[PDB]
Design a binder for this molecule. Structure first.
Ligand SMILES: CC(C)=CCC/C(C)=C/CC/C(C)=C(/F)COP(=O)(O)OP(=O)(O)O
Ligand SMILES: [Mg+2]
Ligand SMILES: [Mg+2]
Ligand SMILES: [Mg+2]
Length: 530
């Protein structure tokens, strides 16, 4: 006897299946972008700029989503600003300097906020009528670490006054403030925040710089072309696996999986990485569904064993349908090895394989606890449930397509560094707070909130409050993990940071398909009108 399928069909049909990129328009865009890019570079390399104007320029280029073209230029400017350690006198410039520096790994001291607080460490209420300062303070309060307790009340302070000011602000500032209160910049998905800023804010800004705006629109639309080409290629690959018919119990969400990948990295250089990553996200959702709503204890046990052994000769020990999954998985990793041969990086593939074996083991433990009706103490729950987030696997997989990723980087990641663990915790805690009721109605007595309630002997509310504090602790750890000197290149930390952002954005409110729908349309269907 099998469970009631239910689930939901892909509401996207096949609108993404084929996309012909007319080079005529792409060539034109590429060509003007080159020119706008240099005009912009020259804007950055201009001498005699005041601090406030320099920070505003960088902040604008970053929000417009084109800063990836100026990594070096922006780095040198912030480095110089860091070392000049000048201390501006207004909240607005000080909070922006603090945020941009910290987001880039420069450990600027939070003491720059002292002058804005009374004698007992609390922000002067007289600042309540400085909206731009409050907005930058608000954004800055989200990048703090455990060593920034002088900013412990910054979030509440700026939030209360911004909510009060918002209704009477001019546009588009009002829209920017309202958006910020719903979604801070530091914790949002990069392309999503960029799309909103370009068309809802900057495009409607009186003082907007026409060069940057045009640059931002053409770039966003040119990259969108690449993304649509990637998604078509992926939809075709997914269509040719035809799990939609052979494994009718599994979800069909290749589009939502691709979106996830787009959140990890959107830049053109990560094209191969994205295609490789989406295949694993899609493949793991199938493995998950198999353990979630179909496979029997006996089948799952054999399924886990086969995975641990990892040999196409083991397929005979599994029931018909699992032979489909199992072979696909083996082939996928064989394909990765093949794709990396050219560059001579096929040896790193095993790291991803180990994470796959690991999550399968934990999936099996998960169902065992379900069958038994076991409610483990939080400590034990987390030891197993962290991996079932899929995040150790996704993070490891995100490195496969990155040309610069070396063995040393994978070794660092294999030891579960603090930044990765923080990202994994955020995902676990957010999902557990959001999926508590549902899973509970299925008698899944081993859900995080339940374990926490029984363990500490507290109410569901108190349990969720404790889990929120864990996510908060985790964000401070991620922020701290980005500070120089970093254990590996920042290029390898960003995907981990982005994974935490994606889950936060997906569960912004306690589905997730209709939460992602509008983002997918904005990033992959509709271009920004020039
Ligand atoms: C922390 C976790 C596990 C999920 C957070 C939300 C989502 C959608 C994450 C994407 C990861 C994938 C590929 C899943 F299959 C996730 O699996 P499931 O969302 O169908 O649900 P359960 O594994 O928690 O039963
Ligand atoms: Mg599951
Ligand atoms: Mg599931
Ligand atoms: Mg859940």
């Amino acid at each position: 006897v099998r469970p009631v399928a239910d689930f939901s069909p892909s509401l996207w049909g096949d609108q993404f299946l084929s996309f012909s990129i007319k080079n005529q328009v792409a060539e034109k865009y590429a060509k003007e972008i080159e020119a706008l890019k240099e005009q912009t570079r020259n804007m950055l390399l201009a001498t005699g700029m005041k601090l406030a104007d320099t920070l505003n320029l960088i902040d604008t280029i970053e929000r417009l989503g084109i800063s990836y073209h100026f990594e070096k230029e922006i780095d040198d400017i912030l480095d110089q600003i860091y070392n000049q350690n000048s201390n501006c006198n207004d909240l607005c410039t000080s909070a922006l300097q603090f945020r941009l520096l910290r987001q880039h790994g420069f450990n600027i001291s939070p003491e720059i906020f002292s002058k804005f607080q009374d004698e007992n460490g609390k922000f002067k209420e007289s600042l309540a009528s400085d909206v731009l300062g409050l907005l930058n303070l608000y954004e800055a309060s989200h990048v703090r670490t455990h060593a920034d307790d002088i900013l412990e009340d910054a979030l509440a302070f700026s939030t209360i006054h911004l909510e009060s000011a918002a209704p009477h602000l001019k546009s588009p500032l009002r829209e920017q403030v309202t958006h910020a209160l719903e979604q801070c910049l530091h914790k949002g998905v990069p392309r999503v925040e960029t799309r909103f800023f370009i068309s809802s804010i900057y495009d409607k800004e009186q003082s907007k710089n026409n060069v940057l705006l045009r640059f931002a629109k053409l770039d966003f639309n040119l990259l969108q072309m690449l993304h649509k080409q990637e998604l078509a290629q992926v939809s075709r690959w997914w269509k040719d696996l035809d799990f939609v018919t052979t494994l009718p119990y599994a979800r069909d969400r290749v589009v939502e999986c691709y979106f996830w990948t787009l959140g990890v990295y959107f830049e053109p250089q990560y094209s191969q990485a994205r295609v490789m990553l989406v295949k694993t996200i899609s493949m793991i959702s199938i493995v998950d569904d198999t353990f979630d709503a179909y496979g029997t204890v006996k089948e799952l046990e054999a399924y886990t064993d086969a995975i641990q052994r990892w040999d196409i000769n083991e397929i005979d020990r599994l029931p018909d349908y699992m032979k489909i999954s199992y072979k696909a998985i083996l082939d996928l990793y064989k394909d990765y090895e093949k794709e990396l041969s050219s560059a001579g990086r096929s040896h790193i593939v095993c790291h991803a394989i180990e994470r796959m074996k690991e999550i399968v083991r934990n999936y099996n433990v998960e169902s065992t606890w379900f069958i038994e009706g076991y409610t483990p103490p939080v400590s034990e729950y987390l030891s197993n449930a962290l991996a079932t987030t899929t995040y150790y696997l996704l993070a490891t997989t995100s490195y496969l397509g990155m040309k610069s990723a070396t063995e040393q980087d994978f070794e660092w990641l294999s030891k579960n560094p603090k930044i990765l663990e923080a990202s994994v915790i955020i995902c676990r805690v957010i999902d557990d707070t959001a999926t508590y009721e549902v899973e509970k109605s299925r008698g899944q007595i081993a859900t995080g909130i339940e374990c926490c309630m029984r363990d500490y002997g507290i109410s569901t509310k108190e349990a969720m409050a404790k889990f929120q504090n864990m996510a908060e602790t985790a964000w401070k750890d991620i922020n701290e993990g980005l500070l120089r000197p970093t254990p590996v290149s920042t290029e390898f930390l960003t995907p981990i940071l982005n994974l935490a952002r994606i889950i936060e954005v997906t569960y912004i409110h306690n589905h997730p398909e209709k939460v992602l729908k509008p983002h997918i349309i904005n990033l992959l269907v509709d271009s920004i009108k020039i």
